[PDB]
Design a protein around this nucleic acid. Structure first.
Ligand code: MG
Ligand code: MG
Ligand code: MG
Ligand code: MG
Ligand code: MG
Ligand code: MG
Ligand code: MG
Ligand code: MG
Ligand code: MG
Ligand code: MG
Ligand code: MG
Ligand code: MG
Ligand code: MG
Ligand code: MG
Ligand code: MG
Lengths: 180, 74, 74, 140
RNA sequence: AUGGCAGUCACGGGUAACGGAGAAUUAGGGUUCGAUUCCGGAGAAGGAGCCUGAGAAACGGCUACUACAACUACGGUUCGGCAGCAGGGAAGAAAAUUGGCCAAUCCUAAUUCAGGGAGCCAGUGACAAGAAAUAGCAAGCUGGGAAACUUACGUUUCUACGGCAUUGAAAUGAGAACAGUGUAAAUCUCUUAGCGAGGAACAAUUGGAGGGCAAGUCAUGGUGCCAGCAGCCGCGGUAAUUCCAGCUCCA
């Protein structure tokens, strides 16, 4: 079988398998952003790292350089749409300063919860896995969805599910359809 | 050193000797998945634990037995 | 009800047909059977039913839409 | 000084010098001449064999115990090999003349701990695992 | 005629060596791989030799030998050559179905319409990759904290948050299905009616708690240098933080 689809690796494993400070930080992350499973934080780390390699290579370059101009512009435009970067920092240097804390805060969980759409950072993660939320024109069943600043406007519940005006689910139906 | 019964060098000796003790039947169960790491965060990295003296923070396995869970809750 | 947005329309004299991309909106309902999409399309473009071939439909995730293709022979 | 040429025409002498001194690095040496291929595994990861003998091996000082072992005849090599049998009363899962799967002890060609000179361990008996058997998942 | 090559390594060995495009790691410099999608080269059991062609030393062509495969009425014969696909045997530590089609991609032909184990489709598939359930929200009883006060235990709230073989209804996929999507047909997905959650069930494991290394300050039971652990240091010789187990805890 010949196949030309590309390879991926989303995360990375630490040089040091056990170190307290790191493990503790990672569990503070898992705690606050309501993750499971350390690799989730690792793949976020990976993502950030990519961003930073980009900014670094671009800072190698002359400020006049066409490539730094175009690609730098592209990187920052790319930040705003995700709202990783505030209005005021459009300089490449501020990319490097990116916190995992900011980047996880762009999660769909982090978004749904902090939108008063869910009681708990955990309530959230079921909800968006329960098929209960729409983002933009789609129905997002994925917790790891990085949120478009622009789609933050339309986050509301699925017209499909209850909370969306749709039929009450199998539970309420089975409870209610048994009389007396 | 005059206590000897079994032949030295017999193969399964210590394992055969060991009494069979049955694993306790658990009331309910241990949550799988995310919920477990929630549980861990709670009993470990949660705000109240952090608030306490970091040098006086209590080590995760300190209690094997339940009498010190009774002494811990009081 | 079924709404049909008709999208990309190429007039193809060579094979003497019209080639079509279709967007079906069925917000409350399951994916539309081709009989219905055919009939609604013919209603729109005024042609005969058996002059229209309807093919390759993709309902999206969450179920408001489908995208498909159509052919209308002269 | 430094006993090493620095000069721009000095290239080959530099590189050749390394191509020489490199031989004193052991892993390089063992790699480069086939050493792997001649070893009882013939370079391989594991091997299958037959059990010639069940043998006890008295541990190195300062430990006393009887390490349960087997002498195996490797089916690929027909070389004779002395291999250790792990955990407890697992020497019982072995019958003389069985098929047995054998791997390294983790020192890649060398013995570990108190067992002197024995470089291999037992993994499978007939078809099954020593682990599977020990924990009593399957039966022989 | 007496040259040609050679320490600027000739000639000759070795390669568990086909060469690249590339792959794994990478501060930088390196190290180590590339049988294997693309491009070259080579070969069709081993050697050699041919026919015919525009192109061949063809090998899903022939001739011979060496070593083999299939019939035989023994005299003869084979459209005998899996390093094509599928499948056997063997070797091994090590690798899938003797399946469906030309619908797509393209190729061939006197050719729109025929053929194609190229290719595609399905099966096997913890090689490897991506996303991701294994529960969520409250309640009653408790802990805990924070305040005030009370001078020494009572009150009150909870911008910490916990914990309960205790109660409550909602939420939903795994499962399973009418239909609709999809296909050459079949399967699967996707959309969706009728269905499908309260506890040993719709229950996660695999490895670890002396150090390296996260986790026991079990007055835990067994064994008493035995059985065994231990990559290394070491643990075990009757109070084992190291074995066999139970509880708990860690990754
Ligand atoms: Mg396949
Ligand atoms: Mg070395
Ligand atoms: Mg190792
Ligand atoms: Mg020693
Ligand atoms: Mg177990
Ligand atoms: Mg090479
Ligand atoms: Mg060429
Ligand atoms: Mg084959
Ligand atoms: Mg055809
Ligand atoms: Mg995977
Ligand atoms: Mg169907
Ligand atoms: Mg349940
Ligand atoms: Mg233990
Ligand atoms: Mg152990
Ligand atoms: Mg004891």
């Amino acid at each position: 079988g010949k196949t030309y689809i590309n390879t991926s690796k989303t995360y990375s494993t630490p040089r040091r398998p056990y170190e307290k400070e790191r493990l503790d930080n990672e569990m503070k992350l898992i705690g606050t952003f309501g993750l499971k499973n350390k690799r989730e934080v690792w793949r976020v780390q990976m993502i950030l790292a990519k961003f930073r390699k980009a900014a670094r290579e671009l800072l190698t370059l002359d400020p006049k350089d066409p490539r730094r101009l175009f690609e730098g512009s592209a990187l920052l435009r790319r930040m705003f749409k995700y709202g990783l970067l505030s209005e005021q920092e459009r300089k490449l240097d501020y990319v490097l300063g990116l916190t995992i804390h900011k980047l996880m805060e762009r999660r769909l969980q982090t978004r749904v919860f902090k939108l008063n759409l869910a009681n708990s950072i955990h309530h959230s993660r079921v909800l968006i896995r329960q098929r209960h939320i729409k983002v933009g024109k789609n129905l997002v069943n994925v917790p790891s969805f990085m949120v478009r600043t622009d789609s933050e406007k339309s986050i509301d519940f699925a017209s499909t599910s209850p909370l969306g005006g749709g039929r009450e689910g199998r539970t309420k139906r089975k409870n209610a359809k048994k009389s007396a | 050193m005059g206590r000897m019964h079994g032949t030295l060098a017999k193969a399964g000796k210590v394992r055969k000797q060991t009494p069979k003790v049955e694993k306790k039947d658990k009331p309910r169960k241990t949550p799988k998945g995310r919920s477990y790491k929630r549980i861990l965060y709670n009993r470990r990295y949660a705000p109240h634990i952090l608030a306490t003296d970091p040098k006086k923070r209590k080590s995760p396995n300190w209690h094997a037995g339940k009498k010190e869970k009774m002494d811990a809750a009081a | 009800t079924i709404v049909i947005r008709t999208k990309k329309i190429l007039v193809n004299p060579l094979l003497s047909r019209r080639q079509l991309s279709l967007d079906v909106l069925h917000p409350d309902s399951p994916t539309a059977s081709k009989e219905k999409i055919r009939e609604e399309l013919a209603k729109q473009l005024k042609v005969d039913a058996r002059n229209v071939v309807v093919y390759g439909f993709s309902t999206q995730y969450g179920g408001g839409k489908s995208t498909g293709f159509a052919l209308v022979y002269d | 000084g430094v006993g090493k040429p620095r000069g721009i025409r000095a290239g080959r002498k530099l590189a050749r010098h390394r191509k020489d001194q490199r031989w004193a690095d052991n892993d390089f040496n063992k790699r480069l001449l086939g050493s792997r291929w001649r070893n009882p595994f013939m370079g391989a990861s594991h091997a299958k064999g037959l059990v010639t003998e069940k043998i006890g091996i008295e541990s190195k000082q300062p430990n006393s115990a009887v390490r349960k072992c087997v002498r195996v005849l490797l089916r690929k090599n027909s070389k004779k090999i002395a291999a250790f049998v792990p955990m407890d009363g697992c020497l019982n899962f072995l019958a003389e003349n069985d098929e047995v799967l054998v791997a390294g002890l983790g020192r890649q060609g060398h013995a570990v701990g108190d067992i002197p000179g024995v470089r291999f361990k037992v993994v499978c008996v007939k078809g099954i695992s020593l682990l599977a058997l020990f924990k009593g998942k399957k039966e022989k």
